[PDB]
């Protein structure tokens, strides 16, 4: 390369930077953190706040370091008298029209304007004129505006145009009367609309559900993971004692960059309603509060009095791996085999991890120049993943879709809508195959709605044939990806949480269980929980599954426990407890260990480390937290192995490949109890 | 300071420095110069006067 | 030339940490907890060694591992224990003695220093490496001049001109 | 709203393509220069200041006019001939803006002798600009005139960058207070400091064009501003006591 | 921003709401489609300012929400960009005005010549201030910055919206006194055509001046380009 790293001088120190880097990036590589208001790493460069002004030799004016490219042998000075005078003057211009609002503003304590004024500004003002006053704007139930505090950095406009894709904000007026918003009364309709509150450096845009409730210095922050979908976005939970006050994203470039959907950000208020805090046993009066010994004894009596073939265990969408392996080992120790998952396709073969995970990974998908989506709506399954797909679209990656046509906030080519179109694509009838055959690194993304189908094996065989013909998987590149929408599904597939052959046969001839264990399940089908059965519900919210149960055992939510979750790319991540257990609830694996002791066959582990070691004994990649293995690819041997499942239950070429998520804002028991999600739905209903 | 509000000309808090001296090994402490500047008679003794006030910087 | 925070008292703190004889002090495992004199069940609890990420609300980087050599950024944290409400007033009650001692007082320059402290005190620890920031921008909007490039809608076709 | 340079319009301009923006008068004189020769064009005016120029003379002038003339002509020659001179005689002159509105004014002493030239108005702490000449006489409130210029620059700010958008209104407020004399004497030095804070610190050159008339007013008529402040207390301090 | 438009956000009115309809006529649609062809097809958005001007004569001197939405659909761009352009520029009226839009320059070269006395004369005659419309719906008074007619200061521009797009007239009236602008307003009100340009000379040629904003005072002197025009000529481009 022709010296792809160039050398600059920052305060007489030599710094090597990549080519095309700005002056601000050279200052950052020298260990200097230049003040800024309009620059962002994820947005396009604007250059309008004038706070990043530094001095370059042989230039008589201050340059804007965010926008100015760095040339070879450049000499940058960041601490001369003109730089300090520039910083103080620009701060003084920023503060003359700002309202004296720090007591009533929610950014007070974590404000860029306050801290930068304290450090790089003066201590006085000389301004005694009247200020500019601006009326506030309505942008929906999630974003609160006090527009007198706007400093015209246009981060919101650039975000709405570039990442969210909706492009609904603009600057109206001219000069001092420039004004941010929508000209007409509109609602911010993006699923990623809470991120702009983080992007605003001031209290012009604040979070409406959070408003006036806390200051940032009072909050104990815990780094956890998000379980509202299958991506597992990295988050920080802020709590005051026993109460969670807000949820924010945190940086992870391999998973979520810096974003978080509105469901994962705003569903925390469902943790304050309908909570199970006591064990209950159903008596002649109904469910009534009982001791833990009594509730464990009743559950053990019902689990032991029934035959082993009349017991079924259903895992919920939010069950961690430790509780799932505990329930699996407890039910298998009694001679049962009927295991089911609330997220569907419980009879799916889980032999090779590459067949139900994203082999390209999330960050490795950016090296693809052509993407074919099969039967998925990524905007409602994972809006952060869809934002990364839009980022790929903006720098040249072409997108095609086989499925039901949906709004994706980027242009795509609709190849078809049914498996007949998939077969026509594999044969060669559609010209998109020649586009895939000439692509350097093609990618195929299969959504969870395909795997929920009754004919999923034939569709997966067609997808495998298409990948074989189009060079999707070859030497040096694996472009085959299967994504999920539930937090607990991949861990259950990893550990082997699946029904036995005898249990599948008994379901085929129509045997009905008498005892059902509901491990956090509230979206079960009626075929799996018969009426008149004995129901043991273990969970944290009182919902459909708890209103029907005979024994209720209160567990922990994901803000109260440290459980393992695996996302759809195969990465093992963990929650952390941000608040203690509520009431008389317990840890979720501990309930099953105590219940195995009361039944009469103890589980061989007595600690959290020991049940994690049992998980690592089943599949060794469980021990490597915050990392992803490279899964083995067995070419067409796996598809040859399951041809009996392709011959039975044949293909349905007329049923469209759709997405199963029909309610984005309410997908589980926590989001169904959230009043903010209900207001979000009501806002979209009252606009018609 | 009502109309002249610039701060970096009076930022005494952040303008102090600590500097690592060159390693004090092969220096030349001459005791002859130290004792040559000392008086030997009652007159020619010079005393450091007591400071009247601590620095106010004009305020 | 060498100038890495060379204008403050931290020069006089980096040395005095490398004074000979005192820079090689070492103890066996769990030995510092025996001589600490605090109850021995305190060391049955688990600790986390990690550097906290940047807050999403602000853009500054001073409390991150970017300035790790300048400022201690690694922390030791413990799991929460039970909390409840006071019946008379509603204040949050606790019985945890390690409720704020790791988050207020224990800060370290590196990961290995916090590990050494945990090892000599007897705490079992898990270490969490922080997520590394990426500085390279996207291909679109890489520089300021790509805002106005020909990648917006392609090269303009000159077919609507007069005389075509 | 202007773009930041770099990039430059000859590299990345209209529709991402190489582009040159030129003035009408620059474009129009080119065929005559190509037909009549460069040596004919450079025979007018001083060195590095070649050619002819259209001059617009407006304000307190007996015969306001758009007239073509050789460059490096004196102001007094350009006004007394071709325009009928200053209304009331040359001794009734107070100030002249020589280059539109974005350049600082000049008083009577500089104007008598200075040539209307690029390298002659610049050394007189002004500029040729567009060579638009605005003449004021001794009946003019020059603070009021520069205050209306400050109002213009407040009205015409595009609002993109912080110093122009916030400080043109501040300059207008301070100038409006100075016109009535409702100010303090050190607020004049504050006003100079605020113009120095705007100038050179913005995206485009409208911020400099907003700072420059106030700088010229302060520099050449600070005594008038001080007298306006002092004599306002002859009508404001009679109510305080 | 101009006069008469104190809001940079939309305010619902029975005349101006989302239910209001706008559509082009045949000839106006021909004009708009001819404007669009001046620009590349993939940069069709370049045509927004002339199209919005033509829409402003079509709608009767102002832009409604329906007109802006129609223009947004026509140029295949988001409506917020159209709202940005329409609120950014001074000529675009976003509230309903009168039939003739009277705009007076107030910048310093016109101000020295006595534009304030012309404003006083207009306000004493028509009975309205800047930013107002008469009770008859005839005249709307506005203020403008420098109009590039400073050697003929003080001047007024008057916009004609009584004939639609085909008969749109934007006429400068220059070198004015109170009597001249009163006569021009009376001539417009009576249905005649007042004379365009300067009221005491042809063009920017040397002649007298308005002294004190109340009286034209003619003055004789040297005038250039009084002889015969120059013949065609070219040097020898070879050597
Ligand atoms: S944004 Fe809010 S907290 Fe920050 S300086 Fe302004 S009023 Fe104070
Ligand atoms: S609302 Fe916030 S992000 Fe948007 S321009 Fe104003 S300060 Fe910037
Ligand atoms: S100096 Fe004024 S006109 Fe120029 S970019 Fe900045 S705000 Fe806009
Ligand atoms: S950060 Fe560069 S001008 Fe705002
Ligand atoms: S100042 Fe009125 S036309 Fe220029």
UniProtKB/TrEMBL annotation, chain A:
CDD domains referenced in this protein's UniProt entry, alphabetically: fer2 (cd00207), MopB_Res-Cmplx1_Nad11 (cd02773)
Record bears the keyword Metal-binding: yes
Ranges for domain 4Fe-4S His(Cys)3-ligated-type: 82-121
Key words, A-Z: 4Fe-4S, Iron, Iron-sulfur, Metal-binding, NAD, Oxidoreductase, Translocase, Ubiquinone
InterPro entries: 2Fe-2S_ferredoxin-like_sf (IPR036010), 2Fe-2S_ferredoxin-type (IPR001041), Mopterin_OxRdtase (IPR006656), Mopterin_OxRdtase_4Fe-4S_dom (IPR006963), NADH_UbQ_OxRdtase_75kDa_su_CS (IPR000283), NADH_UbQ_OxRdtase_ferredoxin (IPR054351), NADH_UbQ_OxRdtase_Gsu (IPR010228), NADH_UbQ_OxRdtase_Gsu_4Fe4S-bd (IPR019574)
Record-level GO cellular component terms: membrane
Pfam families: Fer2_4 (PF13510), Fer4_NDSU1 (PF22151), Fer4_Nqo3 (PF22117), Molybdopterin (PF00384), NADH-G_4Fe-4S_3 (PF10588), NADH_dhqG_C (PF09326)
Family: Belongs to the complex I 75 kDa subunit family.
NCBIfam families xrefs: NuoG
Protein name: NADH:ubiquinone oxidoreductase 78 kDa subunit
From TrEMBL, chain C:
Alphabetically ordered keywords of this record: Electron transport, Membrane, Mitochondrion, Mitochondrion inner membrane, Oxidoreductase, Respiratory chain, Transit peptide, Transport, Ubiquinone
GO MF terms held by the record: oxidoreductase activity
Main location (coarse class): mitochondrion
Gene3D superfamilies in UniProt: atu1810 like domain
Entry's Gene Ontology cellular component terms: mitochondrial inner membrane
Membrane topology: Peripheral membrane protein
InterPro entries, per the entry: NADH_UbQ_FeS_4_mit-like (IPR006885), NDUFS4-like_sf (IPR038532)
Compartments reported by the entry: Mitochondrion inner membrane
BP GO terms, sorted: electron transport chain
Membrane is among the record's keywords: yes
PANTHER family according to UniProt: NADH DEHYDROGENASE [UBIQUINONE] IRON-SULFUR PROTEIN 4, MITOCHONDRIAL (PTHR12219:SF8), NADH-UBIQUINONE OXIDOREDUCTASE (PTHR12219)
Biological function: Accessory subunit of the mitochondrial membrane respiratory chain NADH dehydrogenase (Complex I), that is believed not to be involved in catalysis. Complex I functions in the transfer of electrons from NADH to the respiratory chain. The immediate electron acceptor for the enzyme is believed to be ubiquinone.
Family stated for the protein in its record: Belongs to the complex I NDUFS4 subunit family.
Protein name from the UniProt record: NADH dehydrogenase [ubiquinone] iron-sulfur protein 4, mitochondrial
Upper classification of the organism: Eukaryota, Viridiplantae, Chlorophyta, core chlorophytes, Chlorophyceae
UniProtKB/TrEMBL annotation, chain D:
Residues of the whole record sequence present: 243 to 483 of 484
Main function: Core subunit of the mitochondrial membrane respiratory chain NADH dehydrogenase (Complex I) which catalyzes electron transfer from NADH through the respiratory chain, using ubiquinone as an electron acceptor. Essential for the catalytic activity and assembly of complex I.
Protein name: NADH dehydrogenase [ubiquinone] flavoprotein 1, mitochondrial
Family: Belongs to the complex I 51 kDa subunit family.
Binding positions for [4Fe-4S] cluster per the UniProt entry: 158, 161, 164, 204
Residues of the NADH-ubiquinone oxidoreductase 51kDa subunit iron-sulphur binding domain: 143-188
Species of the source: Chlamydomonas reinhardtii
Domain of life where this protein originates: Eukaryota
Residues involved in FMN binding: 23, 26
Subcellular location: Mitochondrion inner membrane
From TrEMBL, chain E:
Protein name from the UniProt record: NADH:ubiquinone oxidoreductase 24 kD subunit
Keyword Iron: yes
Keyword Chloroplast among record annotations: no
Molecular-function GO term, any one: 2 iron, 2 sulfur cluster binding
Positions bound to [2Fe-2S] cluster: 105, 110, 146-150
Cofactor: [2Fe-2S] cluster
Gene Ontology cellular-component annotations: mitochondrial inner membrane; respiratory chain complex I
Family: Belongs to the complex I 24 kDa subunit family.
Covered residues, full protein: 42 to 280 of 282
Organism: Chlamydomonas reinhardtii
